Amino acid sequence: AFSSIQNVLTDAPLGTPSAMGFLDERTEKPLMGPSEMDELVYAVYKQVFGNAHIMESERAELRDAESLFRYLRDVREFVRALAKSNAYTSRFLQGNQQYRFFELNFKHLLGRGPRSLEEMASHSALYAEGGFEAVIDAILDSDEYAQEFGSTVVPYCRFKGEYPTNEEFNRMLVLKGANSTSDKAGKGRSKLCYSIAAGCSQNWLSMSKALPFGTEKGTGFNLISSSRNPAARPRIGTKIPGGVVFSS
Amino acid sequence: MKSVITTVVSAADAAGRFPSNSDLESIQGNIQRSAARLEAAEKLAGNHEAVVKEAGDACFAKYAYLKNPGEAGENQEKINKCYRDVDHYMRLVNYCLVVGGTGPLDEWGIAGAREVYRTLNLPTSAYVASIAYTRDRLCVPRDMSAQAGVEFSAYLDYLINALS
Amino acid sequence: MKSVITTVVSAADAAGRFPSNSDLESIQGNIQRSAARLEAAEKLAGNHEAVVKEAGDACFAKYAYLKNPGEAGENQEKINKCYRDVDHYMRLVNYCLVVGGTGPLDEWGIAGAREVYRTLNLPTSAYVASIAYTRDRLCVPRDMSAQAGVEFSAYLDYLINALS
Amino acid sequence: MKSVITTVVSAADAAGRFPSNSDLESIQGNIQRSAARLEAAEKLAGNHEAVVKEAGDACFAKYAYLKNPGEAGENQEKINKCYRDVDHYMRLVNYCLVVGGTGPLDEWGIAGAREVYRTLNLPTSAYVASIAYTRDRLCVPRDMSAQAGVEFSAYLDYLINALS
Amino acid sequence: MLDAFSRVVVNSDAKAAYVGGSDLQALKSFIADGNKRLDAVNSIVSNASCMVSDAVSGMICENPGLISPGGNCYTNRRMAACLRDGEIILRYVSYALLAGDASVLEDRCLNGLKETYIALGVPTNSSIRAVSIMKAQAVAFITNTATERKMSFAAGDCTSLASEVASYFDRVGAAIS
Amino acid sequence: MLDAFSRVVVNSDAKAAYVGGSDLQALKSFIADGNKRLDAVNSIVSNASCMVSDAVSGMICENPGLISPGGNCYTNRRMAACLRDGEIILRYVSYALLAGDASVLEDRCLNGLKETYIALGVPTNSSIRAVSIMKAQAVAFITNTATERKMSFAAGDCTSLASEVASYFDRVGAAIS
Amino acid sequence: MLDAFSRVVVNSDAKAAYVGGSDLQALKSFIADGNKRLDAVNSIVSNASCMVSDAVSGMICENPGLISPGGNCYTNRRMAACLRDGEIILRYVSYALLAGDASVLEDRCLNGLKETYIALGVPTNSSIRAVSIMKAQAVAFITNTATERKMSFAAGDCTSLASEVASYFDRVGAAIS
Numbered sequence A: 001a002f003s004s005i006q007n008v009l010t011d012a013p014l015g016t017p018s019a020m021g022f023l024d025e026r027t028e029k030p031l032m033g034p035s036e037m038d039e040l041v042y043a044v045y046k047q048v049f050g051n052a053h054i055m056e057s058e059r060a061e062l063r064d065a066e067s068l069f070r071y072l073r074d075v076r077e078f079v080r081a082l083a084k085s086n087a088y089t090s091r092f093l094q095g096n097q098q099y100r101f102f103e104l105n106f107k108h109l110l111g112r113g114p115r116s117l118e119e120m121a122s123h124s125a126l127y128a129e130g131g132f133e134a135v136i137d138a139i140l141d142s143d144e145y146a147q148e149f150g151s152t153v154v155p156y157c158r159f160k161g162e163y164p165t166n167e168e169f170n171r172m173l174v175l176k177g178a179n180s181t182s183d184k185a186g187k188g189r190s191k192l193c194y195s196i197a198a199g200c201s202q203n204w205l206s207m208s209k210a211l212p213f214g215t216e217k218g219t220g221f222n223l224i225s226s227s228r229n230p231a232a233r234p235r236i237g238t239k240i241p242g243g244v245v246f247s248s
Numbered sequence B, C, D: 001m002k003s004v005i006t007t008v009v010s011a012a013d014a015a016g017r018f019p020s021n022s023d024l025e026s027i028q029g030n031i032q033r034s035a036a037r038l039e040a041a042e043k044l045a046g047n048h049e050a051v052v053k054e055a056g057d058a059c060f061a062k063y064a065y066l067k068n069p070g071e072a073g074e075n076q077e078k079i080n081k082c083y084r085d086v087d088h089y090m091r092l093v094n095y096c097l098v099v100g101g102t103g104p105l106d107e108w109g110i111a112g113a114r115e116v117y118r119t120l121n122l123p124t125s126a127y128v129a130s131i132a133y134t135r136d137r138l139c140v141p142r143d144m145s146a147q148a149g150v151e152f153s154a155y156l157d158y159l160i161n162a163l164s
Numbered sequence E, F, G: 001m002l003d004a005f006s007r008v009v010v011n012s013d014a015k016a017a018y019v020g021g022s023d024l025q026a027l028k029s030f031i032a033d034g035n036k037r038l039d040a041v042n043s044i045v046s047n048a049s050c051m052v053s054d055a056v057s058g059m060i061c062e063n064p065g066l067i068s069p070g071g072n073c074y075t076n077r078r079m080a081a082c083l084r085d086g087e088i089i090l091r092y093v094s095y096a097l098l099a100g101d102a103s104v105l106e107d108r109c110l111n112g113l114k115e116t117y118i119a120l121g122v123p124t125n126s127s128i129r130a131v132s133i134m135k136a137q138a139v140a141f142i143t144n145t146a147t148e149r150k151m152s153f154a155a156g157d158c159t160s161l162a163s164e165v166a167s168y169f170d171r172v173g174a175a176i177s
């Protein structure tokens, strides 16, 4: 856990000042004033919707979720109100494949990528047993959500440095594109559909496209192909005074 | 597309269940009322060049200033564009009268109308004047049966309220 | 309150760090330019009853229809209400010229103006006509020094752009 | 890169708005003070092989044990490595004096210095001794003008604090 | 991202070279016209809405197929969506003009935009036309050459800044091509 | 939140009164010492770490019960949290000094802090001592009265700024009492 | 994930075959050296920090271009991350040695690592060198052959465990190749 590129090649995360005012004897939090709250909501819209170019006819329906937010500063309940709206479902549930919706939730509300097939299976079982709202409630009330973002910050794609598995890093970069990249390029057809169920990894170029500035992205590519061969059994020796031993 | 079937199919999808009889009941509601709703389909379809005729000129009469220099109606083909731009709304109310809900209207004419009508400086009061003209230009007995007239008016004042 | 200080200290708060010299540099930028921007404040502070005088009547002259029955200016005290409602915007540009940013304007006059001006049927073109009147009514050298006129106009056309 | 411009344009990006005069005011703050802060630019640039000369030997004198066997300075080219490793910090304070903020230092020399200085067992007290040496080796009348010395020291004690 | 001062710093870091007095004519001259750049940026952002509204209308003017059914700019949604884009590109070129570097243009806006437009079916040629109209009226405003919209300035030449902003619009035009 | 210029604006808004020339002596005098305030804030933030390290050690100096088992500052975890809170109080009083207004202190740092400390069992008197050492350490740096740490300044009196920052520390001290 | 006992179980499940007495020599012999494996794993994890700091320094020793400007391990950030990469590999090979199976390595480590390094521009050859230095000193510690660092053990041969851990490091080396 060092984040060699979290807070130096990337800006700091955005959100509420601090959670101590939540203890609330005379107020719930220092009135951030209306001009440092409209940028907070602008930031949330850019995250939970992920640059969906929402018109104001479609922002005339999120008035009620917003109006409670500036009154009672929990961010997590704001996104819980947003992800259950028709604005969220009509964009991400309506035209899409299933694991596409599931994987987009990891990008939007958790800021990381699905680490395995079993996580996707657990989400699938949890959806089948009565609704999609259960999926969002499991994610939002999760432990992982508490020990990553909490009730203060916008959920952002954090470079952890100390990932539980490496494919989690790859699949974080593939869902997160560049700026001016949205989530209706493919008509469904999730990007990690094949790679999750198979276990292989993703394209090197599309991961490198999403890296921040000044990170020597893309280089170091040998001109022969990139995916390794599981079936390879190479011999590599060590060096001994008498000879070379293939300690394999 | 906000339709009677679209709401029922989508609710069942969200709940992850098969269509129950509570769902089928709404399509039965469609079964009754399409006949009244689609009787006006004739009336708008075959008579439409005349209603835009009376609506656009009423719009321009109620606000005579807009033909002045620097306003929206300053030359000729902008007036032709105005008449086209109300023709579009008549087309959309016909589509909505066919689908059964406000599906076509609120995503093809209403969604985002506010940006175009402000940045191009088009007063919405002029649109609502022309639409309200046709709202009371209808008398039900001669024009339609009794129930087509209510539902046509109910769709018209929908976008009247939306633009205001 | 969008000010030069509130930007940098909020940024430092978000990053969780002490104010560095990159932060202090902006307040130095304030130190130079308050004198020029504060000159316009006094000018507008004193002469404010005369500018609304010339602005409201220009608004009503450019759109004469607005006094007609059923429009916004149909009786007397609605016209008085209009003149008050431009007085408010002059007050807010004075406040913004004092704070240094667009803080007061975009949360007291701009934030939510769109609901009030559409549901009460108040044409925004009339507001922008009156504001653009004062934008060019002013002559930079005589009324002020050279640089107060730049920044006063820069604040005025801010809300001109915001309303359009 | 934490600079005076990068703060304000990033803030405008987060708010999704155009650059206002509150933003331009900070770059004006830069306009004044670059001349003072870039006057030290030559002073560090042309005189740098001498300051590391006096700084590294002061470091090694203040902590003589460090050359003992098993410590960081146990052979020759590790001492050369030490002198290089302070040369890097001088190169970064020059960069920061040029950009205007602490951009280059806190992402090229400070970010992650922790683990490196612990796992390779390099005492940070030795770094801060050498840096504090140059902090007071400076003279206000002889070395620079008055205000270059303030800001050079303000950048030096920046890293003298972080390392602590 | 980077600016004019952070340009030379990273260029010299590739050499491990100090930023000496030889490299500071470029920056000290950059500071000479500092008031000029500030006088230019508010002139541009002062007409931001009119420039976009003029640009998309000009787009439509010689390509009436975009209004037609099946056109990419057919319904009010798509005008609204397209309308955003004219202003959004304009904001990023204004940022780049302010910073004196296009490092915040081809890394925050133009990265992956061609593919996004290809997937969405956005016509490239008409968008390039919209960008060029915006380009021409950017220079018109910087040089105080607009037919109306008399802005008070200080006398001198802003032609270098005009060339700069034209070069910035150029790379937007070439990024989606 | 608010600053010195946004103070008078909201005060005059309660009267619906324009900000006229009578009210601008306070602000124009505020601008007179503008360089003084900037000369003070970097002097304080320039010694930020040493001030906090000195403050908690001074706290412990005359209250050795905090080290003792069961002390609120017993283990290294507690020696870490309490050492943070020095950075947070000091950072917020520096923000307030910079803005010329304490409208950022009791909404964003001091709001609800007394109850947080009561729930956590943090002793108030020792924390007040820590705040008062930092306060006595603040004025020393503003007035260039520190025994060592000679800082070059411009000659004059910064005493009003010293009283200002003392008043800011006062309300931190009284907020948790 | 799997271990030595869960290896044979899934192998026999592919045949729908019970785990009979014929297949339990491998596991019962696995239990015979159980104390040997425990005696080996703490010997390795007991020197965990020194092994990594020696490994990256050895990497740098014959590739001085990594320190150079533009090197992948140029600034303190990148040393810190590269320092982090060594512990992640060593911890996972220790897990695999403990479980007696590498079913935890290439699903929760190598699986999707080569592409991550390719996107980040991490040089493969130097990383392979770092892994092989770690490999050689893994065997040095298992066999009590380290020049210093005399550890008390029970007399016998741990050579099979040495070859096991060498095979585990082999697949890390081949996974990113």
Ligand SMILES: *C(=C)C1=C(C)[C@@H](Cc2[nH]c(/C=C3N=C(/C=C4\NC(=O)[C@H](C)[C@H]4CC)C(C)=C\3CCC(=O)O)c(CCC(=O)O)c2C)NC1=O
Residues within 6 Å of the ligand: E047, E049, E050, E051, E054, E055, E057, E058, E059, E060, E061, E062, E132, E133, E136, E137, E138, E140, E141, E145, E146, E147, E148, E149
């Ligand atoms: C369709 C056939 C068609 C149009 C629609 C219309 C759009 C258009 N306009 C220009 C030229 C200019 N646009 C300008 C912008 C403004 N003028 C103002 O006073 C405000 C501030 C602002 C927006 C209303 C200006 C000043 C000009 C004159 C040229 C210039 O750049 O100054 C073009 C040509 C594009 C170009 O090459 O500049 C187009 C397409 N004109 C149409 O022909």
Ligand SMILES: *C(=C)C1=C(C)[C@@H](Cc2[nH]c(/C=C3N=C(/C=C4\NC(=O)[C@H](C)[C@H]4CC)C(C)=C\3CCC(=O)O)c(CCC(=O)O)c2C)NC1=O
Residues within 6 Å of the ligand: G047, G049, G050, G051, G054, G055, G057, G058, G059, G060, G061, G062, G132, G133, G136, G137, G138, G140, G141, G145, G146, G147, G148, G149
């Ligand atoms: C650069 C030219 C260069 C180095 C830097 C340095 C790094 C290095 N060291 C070895 C060999 C060993 N490392 C060992 C590790 C330790 N010894 C200890 O006492 C503690 C517990 C631990 C870390 C300090 C040991 C014991 C050895 C001896 C060989 C062995 O494996 O036991 C190498 C060679 C790598 C190898 O093949 O083993 C390198 C690169 N040496 C340099 O040459």
Ligand SMILES: *[C@H](C)[C@H]1/C(=C/C2=NC(=C\c3[nH]c(C[C@H]4NC(=O)C(C=C)=C4C)c(C)c3CCC(=O)O)/C(CCC(=O)O)=C2C)NC(=O)[C@@H]1C
Residues within 6 Å of the ligand: A186, A190, A191, A192, A193, A194, A195, A203, A206
């Ligand atoms: C392949 C091993 C993976 C997989 C990869 C994906 N490809 C994606 C998009 C994509 N790929 C290509 C190249 C290829 N498709 C073609 O039609 C042709 C030539 C005729 C080639 C060489 C193209 C052109 C595209 C874009 C159009 C499209 O959607 O196919 C893709 C989507 C994300 C992305 O942009 O990379 C993935 C995930 N998909 C799989 O299912 C297997 C496992």
Ligand SMILES: *[C@H](C)[C@H]1/C(=C/C2=NC(=C\c3[nH]c(C[C@H]4NC(=O)C(C=C)=C4C)c(C)c3CCC(=O)O)/C(CCC(=O)O)=C2C)NC(=O)[C@@H]1C
Residues within 6 Å of the ligand: A003, A004, A005, A006, A158, A159, A160, A161, A162, A163, A164, A165, A166, A169, A215, G056, G072, G073, G077, G078, G079, G081, G082, G083, G085, G086, G088, G089, G108, G109, G113, G116, G120, G122, G123, G126, G127, G130
């Ligand atoms: C050091 C010996 C290497 C080297 C390492 C670097 N890695 C950098 C970033 C990085 N590394 C990994 C892999 C690591 N993370 C994991 O979770 C696991 C296994 C579970 C491993 C092995 C990841 C995923 C990342 C990116 C994570 C992130 O920061 O978001 C890195 C940063 C360079 C920079 O961008 O500044 C370095 C230097 N580099 C080398 O040259 C040697 C070979």
Ligand SMILES: C=CC1=C(C)[C@@H](Cc2[nH]c(/C=C3N=C(/C=C4\NC(=O)[C@H](C)[C@H]4CC)C(C)=C\3CCC(=O)O)c(CCC(=O)O)c2C)NC1=O
Residues within 6 Å of the ligand: A064, A066, A067, A068, A069, A070, A071, A072
């Ligand atoms: C589901 C039901 C439901 C409601 C009824 C409203 C109720 C409501 N109103 C406001 C918030 C407000 N409500 C009013 C309304 C009024 N003030 C008056 O003097 C009039 C009596 C009245 C208008 C007729 C005003 C003026 C504000 C904001 C005032 C301000 O703080 O500036 C808020 C705070 C929300 C926020 O901004 O964070 C809420 C929850 N919201 C809801 O979700």
Ligand SMILES: C=CC1=C(C)[C@@H](Cc2[nH]c(/C=C3N=C(/C=C4\NC(=O)[C@H](C)[C@H]4CC)C(C)=C\3CCC(=O)O)c(CCC(=O)O)c2C)NC1=O
Residues within 6 Å of the ligand: A098, A099, A117, A118, A119, A120, A121, A122, A124
């Ligand atoms: C919305 C549409 C929709 C679907 C159609 C299914 C499609 C589907 N099936 C499975 C997952 C599976 N699907 C099957 C099904 C079959 N195997 C066979 O040999 C038979 C041909 C067939 C049954 C008739 C099996 C056996 C598994 C799991 C196998 C395993 O991994 O153990 C998964 C993986 C989900 C997960 O577990 O993470 C998905 C998405 N899911 C959906 O969301």
Ligand SMILES: C=CC1=C(C)[C@@H](Cc2[nH]c(/C=C3N=C(/C=C4\NC(=O)[C@H](C)[C@H]4CC)C(C)=C\3CCC(=O)O)c(CCC(=O)O)c2C)NC1=O
Residues within 6 Å of the ligand: B043, B044, B045, B047, B050, B051, B137, B138, B139, B140, B141, B142, B143
């Ligand atoms: C599809 C929607 C639809 C409508 C709303 C009407 C609207 C309408 N009315 C008239 C035309 C007419 N409409 C009427 C009818 C009436 N005049 C009155 O005074 C009474 C209130 C009312 C009784 C029903 C009369 C008398 C004329 C001829 C005079 C006129 O133009 O109004 C015309 C010209 C062609 C025509 O005669 O139909 C049209 C388009 N027609 C339509 O096709």
Ligand SMILES: C=CC1=C(C)[C@@H](Cc2[nH]c(/C=C3N=C(/C=C4\NC(=O)[C@H](C)[C@H]4CC)C(C)=C\3CCC(=O)O)c(CCC(=O)O)c2C)NC1=O
Residues within 6 Å of the ligand: C040, C042, C043, C044, C045, C047, C048, C050, C051, C054, C136, C137, C138, C139, C140, C141, C142, C143
């Ligand atoms: C607080 C801000 C503030 C201002 C900007 C001015 C704006 C202003 N100027 C004038 C009045 C005037 N304003 C100008 C200025 C000009 N006339 C031109 O033809 C040029 C374009 C321009 C610069 C020479 C002139 C010349 C007059 C005299 C009357 C007139 O010209 O119509 C008036 C009407 C009352 C009067 O005559 O003074 C007002 C409100 N007054 C203010 O209180």
Ligand SMILES: C=CC1=C(C)[C@@H](Cc2[nH]c(/C=C3N=C(/C=C4\NC(=O)[C@H](C)[C@H]4CC)C(C)=C\3CCC(=O)O)c(CCC(=O)O)c2C)NC1=O
Residues within 6 Å of the ligand: A051, A052, A053, A054, A179, A180, A181, A182, A184, E056, E059, E072, E073, E078, E079, E081, E082, E083, E085, E086, E088, E089, E108, E109, E113, E116, E120, E122, E123, E126, E127, E130
């Ligand atoms: C920060 C960078 C950034 C941008 C530069 C834009 C880029 C962008 N534009 C559109 C979306 C769009 N872009 C346009 C605009 C146009 N198409 C045309 O035919 C014209 C040439 C042009 C108007 C001038 C249109 C029409 C759409 C919507 C297309 C659709 O209906 O799918 C979308 C996705 C649509 C959505 O999510 O709703 C994105 C990401 N947005 C960003 O985030």
Ligand SMILES: C=CC1=C(C)[C@@H](Cc2[nH]c(/C=C3N=C(/C=C4\NC(=O)[C@H](C)[C@H]4CC)C(C)=C\3CCC(=O)O)c(CCC(=O)O)c2C)NC1=O
Residues within 6 Å of the ligand: C033, C146, C147, C150, D021, D024, D025, D028, E032, E033, E034, E035, E036, E038, E039, E040, E042, E142, E143, E144, E153, E154, E155, E156, E157, E158
């Ligand atoms: C905070 C906001 C902020 C600004 C808006 C600018 C405002 C500004 N512009 C200039 C100054 C200037 N502005 C221009 C520009 C022009 N002159 C022309 O006739 C051309 C039409 C146009 C080219 C773009 C020129 C030529 C100068 C004088 C040269 C210079 O100052 O560098 C000056 C210095 C002299 C003066 O006061 O006029 C200032 C303060 N500076 C700021 O700090």
Ligand SMILES: C=CC1=C(C)[C@@H](Cc2[nH]c(/C=C3N=C(/C=C4\NC(=O)[C@H](C)[C@H]4CC)C(C)=C\3CCC(=O)O)c(CCC(=O)O)c2C)NC1=O
Residues within 6 Å of the ligand: F047, F049, F050, F051, F054, F055, F057, F058, F059, F060, F061, F062, F132, F133, F136, F137, F138, F140, F141, F145, F146, F147, F148, F149
């Ligand atoms: C018995 C326990 C005990 C301690 C642990 C120390 C801690 C300590 N130091 C000072 C006192 C001081 N602390 C400093 C601080 C510093 N001096 C520097 O050169 C650095 C820049 C900076 C951090 C090292 C200074 C300059 C004084 C002298 C009084 C003052 O200037 O405020 C005080 C008095 C607080 C006051 O009233 O000001 C205390 C309690 N002293 C003690 O009596």
Ligand SMILES: C=CC1=C(C)[C@@H](Cc2[nH]c(/C=C3N=C(/C=C4\NC(=O)[C@H](C)[C@H]4CC)C(C)=C\3CCC(=O)O)c(CCC(=O)O)c2C)NC1=O
Residues within 6 Å of the ligand: A018, A019, A020, F056, F072, F073, F077, F078, F079, F081, F082, F083, F085, F086, F088, F089, F108, F109, F113, F116, F120, F122, F123, F126, F127, F130
């Ligand atoms: C924005 C303003 C802001 C603050 C001021 C702090 C206030 C603060 N301190 C602690 C938490 C703590 N705070 C202290 C501090 C002290 N104990 C003492 O005896 C001393 C008087 C003092 C140090 C000088 C300690 C020792 C703990 C943790 C004790 C423990 O539970 O082990 C917590 C709990 C947070 C958590 O761990 O979940 C909070 C909110 N945090 C903030 O966000």
Ligand SMILES: C=CC1=C(C)[C@@H](Cc2[nH]c(/C=C3N=C(/C=C4\NC(=O)[C@H](C)[C@H]4CC)C(C)=C\3CCC(=O)O)c(CCC(=O)O)c2C)NC1=O
Residues within 6 Å of the ligand: C021, C024, C025, C028, D033, D147, F032, F033, F034, F035, F036, F038, F039, F040, F042, F142, F143, F144, F153, F154, F155, F156, F157, F158
């Ligand atoms: C961007 C960062 C930034 C700064 C750090 C300050 C730096 C600074 N301080 C002063 C200027 C000054 N600073 C002081 C302060 C003092 N003199 C003393 O002897 C006291 C010990 C101490 C009290 C705190 C005084 C008295 C002046 C001159 C009065 C004044 O300028 O208002 C000046 C103007 C004259 C000069 O150059 O010295 C400047 C630029 N300004 C900035 O823009």
Ligand SMILES: C=CC1=C(C)[C@@H](Cc2[nH]c(/C=C3N=C(/C=C4\NC(=O)[C@H](C)[C@H]4CC)C(C)=C\3CCC(=O)O)c(CCC(=O)O)c2C)NC1=O
Residues within 6 Å of the ligand: G032, G033, G034, G035, G036, G038, G039, G040, G042, G142, G143, G144, G153, G154, G155, G156, G157, G158
């Ligand atoms: C909970 C933690 C835990 C441990 C650390 C081990 C500790 C441990 N190791 C061995 C026992 C042993 N350990 C070794 C290992 C060696 N002898 C050598 O001379 C070689 C250098 C080295 C090879 C790696 C050998 C050869 C035995 C005896 C054979 C055996 O017990 O299987 C034994 C049984 C006999 C004894 O007590 O020594 C135990 C308890 N077991 C545990 O439960």
